[PDB]
Design a protein around this ligand. Sequence first.
Ligand SMILES: Nc1nc2c(ncn2[C@@H]2O[C@@H]3COP(=O)(O)O[C@@H]4[C@H](O)[C@@H](COP(=O)(O)O[C@H]3[C@H]2O)O[C@H]4n2cnc3c(N)ncnc32)c(=O)[nH]1
Ligand SMILES: Nc1nc2c(ncn2[C@@H]2O[C@@H]3COP(=O)(O)O[C@@H]4[C@H](O)[C@@H](COP(=O)(O)O[C@H]3[C@H]2O)O[C@H]4n2cnc3c(N)ncnc32)c(=O)[nH]1
Ligand SMILES: Nc1nc2c(ncn2[C@@H]2O[C@@H]3COP(=O)(O)O[C@@H]4[C@H](O)[C@@H](COP(=O)(O)O[C@H]3[C@H]2O)O[C@H]4n2cnc3c(N)ncnc32)c(=O)[nH]1
Lengths: 92, 92, 92, 92, 92, 92
Amino acid sequence: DNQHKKIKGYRDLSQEEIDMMNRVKELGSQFEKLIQDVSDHLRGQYNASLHNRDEITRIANAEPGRWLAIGKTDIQTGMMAIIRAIAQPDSF
Amino acid sequence: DNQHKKIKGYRDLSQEEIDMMNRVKELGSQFEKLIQDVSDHLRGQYNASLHNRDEITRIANAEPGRWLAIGKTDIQTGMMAIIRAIAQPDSF
Amino acid sequence: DNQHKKIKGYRDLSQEEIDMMNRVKELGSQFEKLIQDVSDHLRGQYNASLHNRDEITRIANAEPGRWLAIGKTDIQTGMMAIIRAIAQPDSF
Amino acid sequence: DNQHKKIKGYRDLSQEEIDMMNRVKELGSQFEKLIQDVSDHLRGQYNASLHNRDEITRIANAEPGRWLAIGKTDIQTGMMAIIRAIAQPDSF
Amino acid sequence: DNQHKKIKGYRDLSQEEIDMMNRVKELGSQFEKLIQDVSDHLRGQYNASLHNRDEITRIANAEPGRWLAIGKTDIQTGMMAIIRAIAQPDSF
Amino acid sequence: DNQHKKIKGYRDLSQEEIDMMNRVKELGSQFEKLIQDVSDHLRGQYNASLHNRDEITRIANAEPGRWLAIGKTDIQTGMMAIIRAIAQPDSF
Ligand SMILES: Nc1nc2c(ncn2[C@@H]2O[C@@H]3COP(=O)(O)O[C@@H]4[C@H](O)[C@@H](COP(=O)(O)O[C@H]3[C@H]2O)O[C@H]4n2cnc3c(N)ncnc32)c(=O)[nH]1
Ligand SMILES: Nc1nc2c(ncn2[C@@H]2O[C@@H]3COP(=O)(O)O[C@@H]4[C@H](O)[C@@H](COP(=O)(O)O[C@H]3[C@H]2O)O[C@H]4n2cnc3c(N)ncnc32)c(=O)[nH]1
Ligand SMILES: Nc1nc2c(ncn2[C@@H]2O[C@@H]3COP(=O)(O)O[C@@H]4[C@H](O)[C@@H](COP(=O)(O)O[C@H]3[C@H]2O)O[C@H]4n2cnc3c(N)ncnc32)c(=O)[nH]1
């Protein structure tokens, strides 16, 4: 019960602060959908290119799944940083 | 005219690819608004706390404007990485 | 009351999980002290070098306060990522 | 012999500077232990959850091993940046 | 035709701006070669160390392929950021 | 004398390893020059735009000096990571 009071640095949050935090998480949900849509686009692009050696090589050289994972990590850690600016923990 | 053909690594893009790139940029616009709203919340929070030394010190120790700038940078570079997974340049 | 239940994705945490999260925050406190000690070392190094144009230029070219801020940000976001691996939110 | 004199930008370091660098590396060792402890906690949590499809899915959706690797990388590169602020190389 | 005019935020670029962007991409090509050379050095180092358990363990503990991938990602995203400072998109 | 032997995790380096490390630092020097050239381009672009309110606003909204600093940091930390893959310290 009231587990945030047991975690160091965590302060009591107003409803306004919880509302802004939830708004960030929700916009992130739409990014999750977009990233899923991009990942589906990549699978189909790779699928359509089977036995086109030159296009398979181009895709593999561009490394789009790796760049999609990089972008996902940046979106999530950016979310975390925005939520930190709102929630403002009392610890390093 | 057709400046993308003069830039190394840039390939011709389909309308589908341009549409997905534009979708990322649009979701980013909503993040820009959210970040602006958070920045306004911080100014008012700081303003309401003037001449409350303890609360001003708490805010300054939490560094929320710095965390908001960190989150903004991560959101923008994540966008850039997602768009790269879609546009797939032909260069390192 | 019980504000974590109002935030999206947050799940109930066991005492074991809260204990590990607190351990990360505590090791971070020691890093905060170390960073403070480094920052003090830099002020004194700069102070001792006043009116040694060549050494002031060397320090300014090395940009150590900027590198100290970079390292601090990486330590804090690494902490955040470790705590996320423990707390495991249910959201993107 | 004296290999640091063959590497560009490296300057001679005082014992005080070597001591501060070693202090960062030591605090990192404690983080390494903590990360190992978290990784063990994750293996056991996954192990205890075998044949609980819903809990296995929750863990896989939270991606905690990926977040633990992200946090480890941030801790190590933060260490590198702090040590750079101390050692102050003479190169870009 | 003229696909940059269909992408949000993209502005018309001068030849001077395209020239600077291409210069960044070219210096990146040399980094790509260097990274390839390092990767070859690692394969040979690992190869020469087969059935030297202690040296194989040392290499695996140092994780150099992981650090090489980290450095590659930083070089590429740094390139992207420099090119953004030149091309200056009109979007978040 | 032989200060690398006093720093934890540092191992003796072959001449081949020092040569590869120096090659990274040298390619970084060329990036430093490029970044300086970009920074000069930005000053002149801003200078030429004085008392063109709309173009000054466009430049300020694009934040190119901030993006140039982001790219510089990524180039330097990427260099650090590549050099780590070569030098392979024996510490976390
Ligand atoms: N005004 C203006 N700005 C432009 C134009 N083209 C690019 N920019 C800007 O430069 C940034 C970096 O470009 P890049 O060389 O890294 O290539 C990009 C990048 O890898 C990835 C994400 O792009 P974005 O997040 O929009 O960042 C771009 C922008 O800020 O997609 C790559 N990419 C971009 N365009 C293409 C393309 N036509 N084909 C393949 N890959 C592409 C410009 O015209 N105007
Ligand atoms: N004062 C105060 N601050 C709070 C409270 N709850 C969170 N914060 C702050 O927001 C940061 C980001 O939160 P998040 O939505 O990203 O969720 C976190 C994060 O993914 C990961 C690491 O947390 P931390 O490094 O402490 O950063 C947190 C903090 O600065 O753990 C996630 N997480 C946090 N709490 C929970 C939970 N109860 N269940 C699951 N995951 C959690 C707060 O109450 N007060
Ligand atoms: N003036 C001066 N500066 C020095 C000296 N030694 C190191 N520095 C500076 O500290 C930074 C961080 O060092 P590190 O403890 O993280 O170890 C480095 C790092 O992991 C990786 C990349 O190094 P670099 O990008 O040059 O950053 C180094 C530099 O700015 O290589 C590791 N590494 C460095 N030297 C060795 C070694 N001899 N053996 C094994 N690994 C090494 C110094 O003497 N003078």
